[PDB]
Structure formats: structure tokens, C-alpha cells
Amino acid sequence: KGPSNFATM
Amino acid sequence: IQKTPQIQVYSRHPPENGKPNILNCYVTQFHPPHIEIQMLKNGKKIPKVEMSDMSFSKDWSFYILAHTEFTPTETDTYACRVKHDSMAEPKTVYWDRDM
Amino acid sequence: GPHSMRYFETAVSRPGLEEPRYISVGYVDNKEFVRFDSDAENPRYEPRAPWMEQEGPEYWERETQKAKGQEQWFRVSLRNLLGYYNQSAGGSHTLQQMSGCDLGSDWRLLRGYLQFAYEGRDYIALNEDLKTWTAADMAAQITRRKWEQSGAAEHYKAYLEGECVEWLHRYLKNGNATLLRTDSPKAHVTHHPRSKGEVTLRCWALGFYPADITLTWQLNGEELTQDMELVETRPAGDGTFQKWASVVVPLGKEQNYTCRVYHEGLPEPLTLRW
């Protein structure tokens, strides 16, 4: 299962 | 910035004239990922060439395996022709059964 | 027996197309097992190994939703990056991400990974401490400060040490003889004529997995960096790999030449000759 990212770039 | 495709053209199994086999065109180390790869038999585009799905390596560069059924003979020349933004014109590389 | 998992994700924008294409590929021990692609008619995570079919419908639905989340994330970050580099409209742009975990043979976390590239180049990466960030570019510093301010690292760190490790364990169980295996290389040397009184010796390694392998030639002990020829390791296309190394040899002083093949799947390294 992959990341679910946080603050955008 | 553009990275130019490295190209290898080779068979799956050791070639034997008259024996069915598979011909790979392995294109690596390129960027951006957009790319056109043709396989040619005696200079004519081969119809139904399979293309692997977009992948990239840990150095961030993309790579693709094109492949197709073929039967080597004495006389038929096989080649892979790659068009990519990094190159002015298409690059052709010819199948060498010893490599 | 060490293991790993990675997700490799890409968003790509092109001059004309209206919104980016997003692709994500998951690997277990360097083998693709899942994949998602926004170009698909009905975009969903799909199994890419037989042993993943085990997973039930909720697994797929929930991963699918997380993918749609990632797609939106990449879309916004692409738009932000365009501004950070003062790029105009009219080009193509790429954002990539590598994430995942390595475990030792005891199955405990050896190391987490979280790395991004823009236009194919290192943009920002989470350090091994899973606490601090590396970002080289002047433009990239805006992101680093933004993510330091928001405590982004603690959250990725939780993902890496927790969910990443926990789900890899589950996968490793669900596919036990499909990952536990390597194929040893079958090696042979071929002979090719050359310039007067010289022949090329080509040592072939065939049918091996995983791809990492080393080929060497010795004139009785002495290895050869001296214009030894090789090819990059390549897929057979059946899931094994190929590689050869060749050298030029005085026709009839040829027997003085031995090849060696180093590969994990080997009881010990091979020695080969004409």
C-alpha cells in the first residue's frame, strides 16, 4: 500500500 | 533537461535460423517519458509490436521494452527505430545476432 | 532473506493536454505487483501479480481512492513548481516520487524512502533519519520550509515505519514462493573471428533473476578493465535477464582466458572458458 502524501509542494 | 535513449536490440532465445523467437528493443535512460519506438523487418515497420508500460528507474530515467514475434533467417535484417525529443532525427539500431 | 517495497509515481503534463496523467506502480522485492493509470477508461488499481488477486474488493476500492488523492496532489504540486521555477506555459513537465521500505532478513525495518524529482532531477528527499529534508535547489527551499513548518516528515515517518512495513509483511505472506525465489544464471562462452590473428570471446549469462549480476574475465588471476566490452543488463522479456562480456584474445593463446559470473542465486561464483 503506497503513501498518501501530506502538504503539497 | 533531455536524456537520450540507450537502445539494445536482441532476441529472447539464442537465435536459430528458421526457429520462432522473440525480438526485443530495450530503450533505457531517457527523459522526458514521451517516446516512439518502431521495429522494422527489411526496413518495413513490423505490424503488431507490443510495448511494456511506462516505468522508471531509481535514477529517475524512464525505460521501455518493445518486443515482437520473429523468425530469424540468413537474409532478413531487423532493426529498432526510436524517435525522441532528445534527438534531431530517429535513431535506428540493427539486430546483431551475436550480441 | 531481505525484502523491500516501493511505490513509483509519476505525473506528466504536456503542452496541449488539459490535465496531467498520473501513474503509480507498486513493487515488492523489485517486482511490479500493482499499478494505477489515469489514462485507463476506468482508472483503478489493478493487480500485476497473480498472488495479489487474493485481495478483496475493498482493498482495491480504497487504494483506488488514495490514487485519486495522489493524482490531485501531483496536479497541484506541478502547478506550484511551474511557478517556483518561473516556467512559462507551453512545455512538458514531470514530477516523480519514490517511496517505500527496506526490511532486513529478520523482517524489521532497515530503512524508509521518500524522494521526489522534478523534470527528472532531485527536488527534495526525506533523509534516513526520517526527520530532516534534503533539497538542493534554491527553488526547492520554498517546499522544504513549507514541509518543515507543517510537520510533513513525522507523518511520512509514521507511514514508513507503520503501514509500509505492516502491508509488506502481509504481501510477503500472500505470495511466498513467488518472491522467495531467484533463478541462477546459465553461462556459456561463444567464439567470434576478428582482425588477423585475433578472436572475440563472449561470455553470456542467461536466464537469471534478479537482474544484479557481475561478469569478469581474467588472464590467469588478473581482471580486466582494459577495454573489456559488455552490454547493460537487459530483460529476456519472460521475467529473466541477459548480460554478456567479451574480450579480444590472440587466436590460439585463447585458452589462457577464464570468465566468472557472480550472482546471488549461485552456490558460488561460476568459472567458464572456451
The CATH number assigned to the domain holding B96 equals 2.60.40.10
Residues C26 and C125 reside in one and the same domain: yes
Alpha-carbon distance C59 to nearest alpha carbon in chain A (angstroms): 9
**Which residue of C lies nearest to B51 if distances are taken between CA atoms?**
C237
Residues 55-114 of C with CB under 8 A from A: 63, 66, 69-70, 73, 76-77, 80-81, 84, 95, 97, 99, 114
Asked if residues C9 and A2 have their Cβ atoms less than 8 Å apart, the reply is: yes
C142 and C29 share a domain?
A: yes
Cβ-contact C269, C261 below 8 angstroms: yes
Do the Cβ atoms of B54 and C10 come closer than 8 Å?
yes
- The domain total for chain B is 1
Q: Is there a single domain that holds both residue C203 and residue C163?
A: no
Q: How far is C62 from chain B (nearest CA, A)?
A: 23
Q: What is the CATH number of the domain that holds C68?
A: 3.30.500.10
Return the CATH number at C190.
2.60.40.10
User: How far apart are alpha carbons B54 and B57 in whole angstroms?
Assistant: 10
Phi-psi region of C63 (alpha: psi -120 to 50; beta: other; left: phi over 0): alpha
Which of C97, C155, C167 minimises the CB distance to A6? C155
Is the Cβ of C135 closer than 8 Å to some Cβ of chain A?
no
User: What ranges in C165-239 are assigned the alpha helix state H?
Assistant: 165-174, 176-179
Query: Looking at chain C, after which residues does the C atom sit over 2.5 Å from the next written N, breaking the chain?
Result: none
Of C181, C212, C229, which residue sits at a domain end?
C181
CB contact under 8 A, C96 and B56: yes
What does this entry list as its resolution, in Å? 2.2
Q: Are C101 and C150 in the same domain? A: yes
Q: Same domain for C24 and C85?
A: yes
Across the interface, do C37 and B12 touch by the CB < 8 Å criterion?
A: no
Which residues in B30-67 are b (16+ Cβ under 10 Å) and which e? bbbbebebbbbbeeeebeebeebebbbeeebbbbbbbb
User: Domain range holding B36?
Assistant: 1-99
Closest CA to B96 of B10, B5, B25, B20: B10
Cα–Cα distances in Å, from C22 out to C19, C44, C70, C119? 9, 12, 8, 15
Query: In the listed set C181, C197, C223, which residue is the last one of a domain according to the structure?
Result: C181
Residues C92 and C161 in one domain: yes
What does residue C103 show for φ and ψ, rounded to 5 degrees? -115, 145
Bridge partners of B36? B83
Phi, psi of B8 (to 5 degrees): -130, 135
Do C190 and C137 have their domain in common?
no
Q: Say if residue C210 is in the same domain as residue C166.
A: no
Residue that terminates a domain, selected from C138, C154, C181? C181
A-chain residues near C95 (CB < 8 A): 9
Task: Tell me how many domains chain C contains.
Answer: 2
B66 Cβ contact partners less than 8 Å away, ≥ 6 residues apart: B24, B25, B26, B27, B37, B39, B49, B50, B51, B52, B80
Would you give the DSSP letter of residue C161?
A: I
Domain hosting residue C153, numbered range: 1-181
